[PDB]
Structures are given as structure tokens and as C-alpha cells.
Amino acid sequence: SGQDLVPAAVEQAVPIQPVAGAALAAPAAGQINQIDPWIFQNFVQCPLGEFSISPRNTPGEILFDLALGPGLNPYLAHLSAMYTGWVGNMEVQLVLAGNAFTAGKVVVALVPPYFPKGSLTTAQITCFP
Amino acid sequence: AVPIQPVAGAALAAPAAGQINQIDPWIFQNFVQCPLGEFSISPRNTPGEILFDLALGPGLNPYLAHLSAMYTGWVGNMEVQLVLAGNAFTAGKVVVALVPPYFPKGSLTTAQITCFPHVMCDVRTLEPIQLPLLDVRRVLWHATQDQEESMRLVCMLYTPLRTNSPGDESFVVSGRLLSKPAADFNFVYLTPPIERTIYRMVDLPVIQPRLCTHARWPAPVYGLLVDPSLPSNPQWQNGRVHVDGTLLGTTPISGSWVSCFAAEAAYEFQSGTGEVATFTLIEQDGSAYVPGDRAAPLGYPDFSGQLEIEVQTETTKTGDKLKVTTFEMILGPTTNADQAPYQGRVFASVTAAASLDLVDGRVRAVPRSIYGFQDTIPEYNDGLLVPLAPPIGPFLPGEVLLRFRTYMRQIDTADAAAEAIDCALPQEFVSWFASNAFTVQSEALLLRYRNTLTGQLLFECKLYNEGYIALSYSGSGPLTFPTDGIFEVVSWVPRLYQLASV
Amino acid sequence: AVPIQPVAGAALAAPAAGQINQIDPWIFQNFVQCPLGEFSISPRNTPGEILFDLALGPGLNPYLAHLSAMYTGWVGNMEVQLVLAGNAFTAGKVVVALVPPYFPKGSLTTAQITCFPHVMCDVRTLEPIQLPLLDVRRVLWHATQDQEESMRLVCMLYTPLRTNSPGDESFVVSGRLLSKPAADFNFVYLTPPIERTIYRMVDLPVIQPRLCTHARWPAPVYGLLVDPSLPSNPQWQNGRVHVDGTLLGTTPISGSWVSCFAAEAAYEFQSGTGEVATFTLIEQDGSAYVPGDRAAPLGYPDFSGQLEIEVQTETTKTGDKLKVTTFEMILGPTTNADQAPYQGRVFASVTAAASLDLVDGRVRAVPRSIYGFQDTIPEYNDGLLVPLAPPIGPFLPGEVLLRFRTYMRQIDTADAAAEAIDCALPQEFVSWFASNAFTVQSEALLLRYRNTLTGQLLFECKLYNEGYIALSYSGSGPLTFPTDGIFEVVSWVPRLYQLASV
Amino acid sequence: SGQDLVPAAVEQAVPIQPVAGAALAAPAAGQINQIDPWIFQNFVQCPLGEFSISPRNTPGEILFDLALGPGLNPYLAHLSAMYTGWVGNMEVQLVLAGNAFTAGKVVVALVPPYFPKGSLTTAQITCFP
Numbered sequence A, D: 001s002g003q004d005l006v007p008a009a010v011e012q013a014v015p016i017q018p019v020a021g022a023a024l025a026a027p028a029a030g031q032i033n034q035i036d037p038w039i040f041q042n043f044v045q046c047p048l049g050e051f052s053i054s055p056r057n058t059p060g061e062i063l064f065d066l067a068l069g070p071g072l073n074p075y076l077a078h079l080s081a082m083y084t085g086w087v088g089n090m091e092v093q094l095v096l097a098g099n100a101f102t103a104g105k106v107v108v109a110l111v112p113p114y115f116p117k118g119s120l121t122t123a124q125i126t127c128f129p
Numbered sequence B, C: 001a002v003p004i005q006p007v008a009g010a011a012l013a014a015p016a017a018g019q020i021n022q023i024d025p026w027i028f029q030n031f032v033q034c035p036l037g038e039f040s041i042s043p044r045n046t047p048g049e050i051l052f053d054l055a056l057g058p059g060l061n062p063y064l065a066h067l068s069a070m071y072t073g074w075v076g077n078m079e080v081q082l083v084l085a086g087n088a089f090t091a092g093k094v095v096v097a098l099v100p101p102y103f104p105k106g107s108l109t110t111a112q113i114t115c116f117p118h119v120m121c122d123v124r125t126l127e128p129i130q131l132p133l134l135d136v137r138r139v140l141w142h143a144t145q146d147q148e149e150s151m152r153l154v155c156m157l158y159t160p161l162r163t164n165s166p167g168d169e170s171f172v173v174s175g176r177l178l179s180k181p182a183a184d185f186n187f188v189y190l191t192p193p194i195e196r197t198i199y200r201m202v203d204l205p206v207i208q209p210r211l212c213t214h215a216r217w218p219a220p221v222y223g224l225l226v227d228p229s230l231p232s233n234p235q236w237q238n239g240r241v242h243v244d245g246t247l248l249g250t251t252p253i254s255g256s257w258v259s260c261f262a263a264e265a266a267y268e269f270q271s272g273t274g275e276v277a278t279f280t281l282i283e284q285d286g287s288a289y290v291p292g293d294r295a296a297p298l299g300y301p302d303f304s305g306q307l308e309i310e311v312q313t314e315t316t317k318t319g320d321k322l323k324v325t326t327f328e329m330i331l332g333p334t335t336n337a338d339q340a341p342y343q344g345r346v347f348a349s350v351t352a353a354a355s356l357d358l359v360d361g362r363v364r365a366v367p368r369s370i371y372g373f374q375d376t377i378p379e380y381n382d383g384l385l386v387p388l389a390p391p392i393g394p395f396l397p398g399e400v401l402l403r404f405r406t407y408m409r410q411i412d413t414a415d416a417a418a419e420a421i422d423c424a425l426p427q428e429f430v431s432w433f434a435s436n437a438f439t440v441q442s443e444a445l446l447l448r449y450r451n452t453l454t455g456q457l458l459f460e461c462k463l464y465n466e467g468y469i470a471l472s473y474s475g476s477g478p479l480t481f482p483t484d485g486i487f488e489v490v491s492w493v494p495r496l497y498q499l500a501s502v
Ligand SMILES: C[C@H](CCC(=O)NCCS(=O)(=O)O)[C@H]1CC[C@H]2[C@@H]3[C@H](O)C[C@@H]4C[C@H](O)CC[C@]4(C)[C@H]3C[C@H](O)[C@]12C
Pocket: B260, B262, B284, B285, B286, B310, B311, B312, B362, B363, B364, B365, B366, B367, C218, C219, C222, C407, C408, C409, C418
């Protein structure tokens, strides 16, 4: 083990307020619906959760682009065949722990809804949290 | 004042937006004018007229219409105020009603306007009527980049206007609506600013018309003029476009495609009047042409007469290989012509005495001159269907088209006066409007011809959102304008907006 | 940290501004990237290189560059931070210095960069170097619509970079500058938003090149391609423009003016090889032409060969009045030609056997075909001066011009292969850039050819602010691209920005 | 960043007393002369302030040799055209921060006045502070 690496990229205070989950949609669905309290307890790998940065990539390439949903969890992508609806936030871990000799930086943004899909150049991915 | 509950703005939309973004506190101070928020009540109006009808958004304020490209959403109320310009000797009322964000459409009679939460204002009030514009909605917030259904203010003439009038003007009572954000307007989520928004006013190219290019015949533009004598409602097929960026008929993007066609060379000799080639038309970009919405391939001539294409002739006869001969084509009916560009076939005839050993290939044609030119639709089909652009109208009483006359190469045998073809929009505007693809706000722009050197107006014309310019002319003689100015968009007007007489 | 006093922002400018306008408090939260604030330190760089040089303003932030059209002025500091991408095994420093708002120009050696208030950053630092950008000024506030002298950040390579490198890539240490407003940034006076500002990025027309029109010969554009074989630095005179809206040479606005001239008809018969007309050239808009900066009137052909204008012939001989004959003109020297368009005279010769009774008037000429076409400057003067546009360069090592080839009507007697004339910018961009008149930020745009249907790149080219496109090609064979995509401006780059190999 | 390097070569207690600067020459010049208090506030690179150690150098080579003066400062080498005289100490920073793989040691001495110039072998450069 050696600490000639970066210790931790501790989530900066991203400029965003807290958002309500199932507390807004609860008096508008006609059921009491809860999911296993053990699904909230471990981080399991996404269905689309595998990328790679080679040195043939250029600045601006989009490494991953995944919309908040139940498609971000093998558990909830399976539970979401029985239900019609969802609300709430998710917590994502990003595991890049490259060699001690590599160098480079990725930037992970928080693109809001209704923002046009497509290009999203490198000059404008920083204007988001 | 008005029978509505108070409507929560940014307090209902807060627990579900990443951010709630504040606005400069100096914007909640000024009453800025609403676009299309002006009217005028003449004593010839019948009660029931709808003076204005404008929907709550950020498009009502130039500050917010510009701030609303940095953000994703908005929520909240606005304060509007209606000012009326009438003295103590007028008489008449005006009912301003808050229409909910549904309630479809149709003639609202004055019986029905008083059924909404409304305010009934006498014409002879002093201080401006202030009234709210609440955000009644089904959703938490609104999206700035997608026009949605929000509360309208509709103004209607309740009882008519009773005044005297000297001899001119006829005393119209004017009125203007001015709005500002309420204390709880908010945008939602800071995005990177985009330029192709929807509250982006139509701007025009800064190019004098003399430097432009014509749309129906490939030549410069030599004079813009009004002319109450010619057919007031023509049906041209080139130089037709919508201000929202939609090409109408056989109008091409480029100006090289005008009065031209790329065809298939099908050559064969004949011992009659000369050589005759049948051309299988295609689109000049090289894409397979099929009979569709247009009355001909893109750019095919829209006039009637004797046109003469040139070539692409490869001759295998010894002495020369590639030459430039002049064919001949008839555009008018003449009661003897198999002219059907619609289906993709045209007939060209040169008067040759021997055989021209011409290889069959792919050619494209360039006009040389015209003989017997008539401003009249050609034969896109023999006597058959032509899905074509409608005529160029209608105009208000006392408004005449503004034509961009150029002069085409005439083959004549009786006179020498140059003939004038003309279009409604030079080929620079046809490319501008298509490349920008603006958002049409109401019905008609309001241009303003100015002189760049002097700095004085020449006239105020009106660009209809259908792609032609009108102009309120009274006289009868062709009045020609200078061709060294600049068109400048002022604002959006309704159809019935009456110009100033030129 | 840095040896500067604290600089008062909006407290010095307050008693003399009508308003002091606040900014959304969510803009003081994010570090947004600065335009042109990126570099890369290779191990082949010598100390003294200037990696970036950027001036305090509102042009450093996309939020403020957009908010700064609603207002008149600004004041205050910014916070910038430099991130560097290097591991523990690199070695090298970088000095970031605060240059005052004067101190003219020139090669700043590394001896002199350490004399400003600076910060010396090792390449192998972890957390981003944060440093201020104060507003040192002579005046109370600044005007947003007038670039002025404000404090710069200049970054210089102090000691060189010592690392290993596998075989590819060569380990460049990248770095990026990101800024946000300090706690006391303010705009001054709310005006109505204007669209023709100075922080308005260059946008391109949304038009596929196949739909465009050529700039040197009046025809459509049939293929864009690179070609390392032809003259790498041509000296064309049509299709030359500056991205800041300045027409270079004999480039016209319109596409109808290309390879054309309006001339004075001076007709007289001669019993030699035929009829010969001397033309007194004028500007096609009808304005009196005088020898000036251009090498010929606006639009006169810029190729060399045997061109054949058409007419404006009015014949008073009985039988016909207005016809279309084909003259002939020589553009190359041929060692026997009085070709001087510069002074306003050209010679045209048709091979006639009898007298053509042609009235003297005002004509204008249209090309018909070319014989013996050579990509070489014609004789604008006999052997005399020609104030002309410079060649098209220079390019970096391994970059070749991107040409918009069209095919002109060839008169041939030995073969049939179509010849390709080509320009650097189709005639739609020449009108776009002139009608908008953008503000050039640094040295070269960075376009991006995409496909509208699929949605995948084709190449990344580079539009130099001198009006031509370059492209980093390695091979030697002419590589032709599809002509159905869209050019998309990405950002401003320096000259030395190295493209990605196509 | 990595700390498989040497943290800091913090100036050892070099055996030398403090020396008086302008307090001795003040009652012997007929003027009150002060220099900008901001020139004392940042370290700027010497006029002769650039050397390099290659592996072709041998132990004993003199990397730099710079006499105390106003020639050690671009600021004071410019101010010293208006005056005839000077006194006082200077503070010098030495920036060698070589790669993590290099190895070697330099020794910086404090040679007094009147010491003969010339050879200064490696056996005797350590006899100085
Ligand atoms: C016959 C064309 C030569 C140009 C010409 O004859 N006149 C140009 C001026 S004018 O309008 O006649 O006035 C040749 C040269 C360029 C050719 C075209 C180009 O090769 C582009 C496509 C390529 C496709 O394979 C075939 C159709 C095509 C669309 C070709 C049609 C035709 O063979 C063209 C148009």
C-alpha cells in the first residue's frame, strides 16, 4: 500500500438543496408500499456500471451517462416489474482507482431534466453541479 | 378585488427542485411593457372585440425572457397594470378577465367574459388598473424551454365607446399593459445558457437589398417597389418561406438552385425540327426525386415562356468533346407540350440540321434567356393536379405587396424595354429564416426600413409570418424606394395592426 | 499568499452608479471553466512558454457573460483555481502571476514573471491552487460593452517537466483554469437586453454543404475534401472573409456576383477575327468604380483561362432586337492581352463574319464555360501592381486545407473528366460572417463536423479567424468526406492547438 | 503528490552571528534613504539565478557562485544606478526539487571576504558555514 495517490475526492459541497422523495407522492398513491430495508444497506454494481478510460480517448468523451431511475440497481430493476411508479434519490459510488503512474481527471456532472440531449461539450459540463 | 384564493408559488415547488434561484431585486421595481399588450378602441368597434389576450410566463418581461435561458424552470405570479388614455368626456368600459389555463378556445361573447374572475374598468379612469396574474398549475414548476398552459389575461370591450371626433384623427382610446414579477417569482435550476431559445426575437440580416440575390431568377436585385397595378395576389413558387423556417413550395436554400435543374441525359436524334432530349429530373443535390408535396423538383422555374437551358454535352465526334450548346424549353401550355416536371420528365428541343453525337449522362441546366415571359404558373403537369403554395395574401384594405424586382435576359423581336420579374423575399432572407428557425409569436412582424448613412426612416412595412411584406399605400402610381437601406425588426403585431400610410 | 492590498469593489463605485445590481447567489457556488483557460506541458517545452494569459472580466464565466447583456457596468474581484493533472513522479513548476492592467506586451522571460505578485506551483500538487483576480482600475466601474484594460493572470512554465514516457502518448501534464465571482462582484445599471453584444460566441449556419453555393464559380458545392497534393498555400481572391466580418479581396456578399461583372458596352466592328468590345467595368450594384484596395471590381473571376461572357446586346438590325451571343475572354497572360480590370477595362472578342449592329449601353456578363483552366492568379494588371489578399496560411506541421470542390462547365477537345475548382468557404458562410460581424476572441475556432441523422462525428477541423479551415491529416491520398453533415462551433482555441488526426 | 522525497532542508543552525546592516552606515551618510517596503515582500529570481546539475558533472564542480550585492535582485540591480553605496543582508531561496528518482547532494557554503578566489576544492568547502 502506498499513499502517493489521491486520498479521497470527498464529495465537494455540490450546489444543490435536498430534494423530497416519497413524502410528496405518498398522499397521491392509493397503497402503502415499502421495499426491503436491506436493499438500502449495500452498494451493488449498476447494470450499466462498467466503463474504461484508455489513452486513446480525448478530452470531452462521455464515459458514462446514466439517468436516475430503477435501472441503476439490479435489485430495483427487478422490483420494478411489479410497480408502476417511483420517486426518490439514489447514492452512487464511482470506483476508479487507477495505477500510481496514471494521470488525468474526470468530471461528473448533475444534468437536470429537460436539458437537451446530444453534444454536451466540455466547456459546458462544468456549468452544472 | 378579484375572487381567487392566493396561489402558492415557490413554496410548493421547493421540495422538488434542486435549487430555487432568486432574481435581481431591481426587476421587481419597474413595470416593463408586455409584448402584444397594446390596443386601441375606436368608436366603430362593437362590444365583444378582444383587445388583448396574453399568457402568464417569462415571455412578458424582457428582463425575464433573457434571464430564462440560464435556467430550467420558473414559478410564480406577476403583477400587471393596464393604462388607458381617455379624458373625462369619453364613455365605455373594458372587462379584464383571468382565464384559467385550459378552457379551450372560441368566440368569447361578452356574456361569458363576466363569468371569470374579472375587473370592469371604465375607459375614463385616471390611475392604472393593477391586477394580479396568478400561477394556477397542475404541476410543481414549469419548464422554460417548452411553452405550456398557463393563466391568461383576456381583455374585452364590454360597452362601446361614445365620444365626439373632430375630423381627423377619429379619437381612438389607447391602452397598454405593463407587467413585473410578483414578490415570489423564481427560476429553478441554473443550466449553461443556450442561444437557440424560444424567447429569441426575429432578427434580420444586415444587408442592403441591392447587395442581395433574387429568388426566382438567378440575378441581383435591382429595385424594391410597390405597384397596385399588377395582380395583387400572385401564386409564385420560388421565394416562398415561413418566418418559422419552413420552405413553401419549390423554394431552395441556395441561390444557385434557382431556375435550374439537374436532369438525366436521354439523347436521341430526329430528322424533324432538330435534336430533342427527354430529361429525367432529379434533385440537384444528387438524391433520388419522387413526386411528393412540391409541384416540381427544388428550384424548377415558376414562370411561363420560352426558356433555353444550356448543357452538359459530351460529344464523341472527332474535333471536340465537351461543348456548350443552347437547347430550348417551353414553359407555357401552348396546347402542344408534354411538360410534366411533376412526374420527372421534361422535353428540350434544339434546332439542329445534322446529328449531334451526344453521350447519355447526367446533366444540369442553366437558363440563358426567356422569350414571351408571362407572370403566370407554368405547366407542372399537363392539365392535372399541382399541390402548390397558396396565393400571397390576404392583405388588409389598402395594403399592397412589396416586390423585389430584378430584370431577366429577354430575347425580343419588337422592343427593348427590360422586363421585371419579382419575388417577395430575396434569396438571403430565405436562407436566414431557414438557418435560424425562429419561433413565431403572433401573426406579423413590424419591419422598419432605415438609411444607414443618414439615419431616417423610409417606410414601415409588415412582414407576415407567411413570408411576404405588405405596406399601406394609398395612391395608384408605382412608387419606387431607394435600395440602400436596412430592414429592422421592431416587434410583433397582430394581423389587424394598421400601418402608417407611405 | 500574494503581496497585494485588498481591492475595494462595489464600495468605491456605489456613490456614482444609479444602481448596484446583485447576482444569483448560486453563481458564487460553482467553479465554471474559463474560455481559453487550458494548457498542456509536454517534456519538449522550454521554460518561458506562456501557457495561458486571461484578463479579468465577465467573459470568464458563462453565467456572467450572459447576465452582462442586461446591464451597463461591472465591478469586483474573481476567484480562480488552477487544477493540474500530474502524478507523484513528475517534476516541474509553473508560476502564475498577476499582471497589472497596463504593462504593455512582449516576451516575458522567466526572469520577469517572478517579479509580479505571483504563486509558484509544483506540477505534482494535489488540491487545486486557488488564487484571487483583483480589480485594479483607474475608474469607478467598467463598461460591459467595451473591452478595457483589466488585471491579467499569466501562467508561465518556470522549470521544465522531467518524466518518463512509454511510447505513446508522451505524457503531457494538463491543466485547466476555473473561475467564479468573488463575494463582491456586481453589475451596475439594468438596461434592456441587447443581442449584438461582444461576449456572443460565433455560431454557424445550420445548412449542409451539399445545399450550399460555391464562392468562386456560380454553381452548387459537390464535395468537401482534403488533398495534400495541390498547392498547399493558394492565393484565391473569392471566398475570402474574416470571421470578424471583413471581406478580403474581391469577395462579394451575394452569390450572383461571383464570376461576373457589370460593364459599359463600347461596341465597334472590325474586319479581323470578328467583333471586339471594350468593357468599362463598374460595380454590379450600379456605383461608380474607382481603383482602390481590391484587385478588381467585386466578383471578377480569379481563375485563369478562356472564359466566355454572354451579353446584353440590343441589335437595331431588322429581324431581331435583343439576342444572347457568346463573347470570349482570356484570363491568363498569353503574352498578348490588354487585360487590366484593375483600371476598369477588359477586352472581349467574338468570332463573327459580318457586322453585328449592337447599340452601346450598359451590359452585365455571365460565364458560360472555361477553356484551359489553371489554378493561378489571372492578370488583374498587365504586369503591374495588384494589391491582393495574401496566401492562405500558414498551417501547423501536418495540417492541410479543406476545400469545397465544385465542377465548372469545361470546353474540352481531348478528354471529358470534370475539373474541380474549389474555395475555402461556401458562399453561405461569406454572407453569414458579414451579416453577424462577430468579435474574434483568440485565433481559431474549433468546428466539429457531425451527422444529423446518425449523430456521430466525422472530423474535428479548425476555422482560422482569417477565413479558411484546416485539418490534421497524416496520409497522402485525397480523402473525401460525406457532404451531408453540419458544422458545429465548439470553442476558441489558440493557433498551436493540435487537432486529432483524421 | 508524494512524500517519497525529502520534506524540507530547514536551514540548519549555520554557525554565524547576526550582522548589522544599515544601522552602522546611517550616521555616516548625509541622507535619509529608504527603499520601497514592497520590494522586501516577495522573492524574485536573481539575474544569475539559473543553474543545472546533469549526471556528467563531477563532485567538486561549482554550480553557482554569487557575491552578496545588489546584483542578486532585478529590483535592486535597477535601483542601484541612482545610489553609490549599500549595506545589509539578503535572504536567498534555492529551488531544486528534482525528480523522485534522482539522488545527490549539493552543499552551499558562506565564503567570507578576502578569501582567495579560484579553486575552492571539495575538501575545504565544508570548513565554512
Ligand atoms: C454535369 C455536371 C458538370 C457541371 C455543369 O455541367 N454545369 C455547372 C454550371 S450550370 O449549372 O450548367 O449552369 C456534372 C459535374 C458534377 C456532377 C455531379 C456531381 O458528380 C455530384 C453528383 C454525383 C453522382 O454520382 C451523380 C449525380 C451528381 C449530381 C453529378 C451530376 C452531374 O454528373 C454533375 C452535376
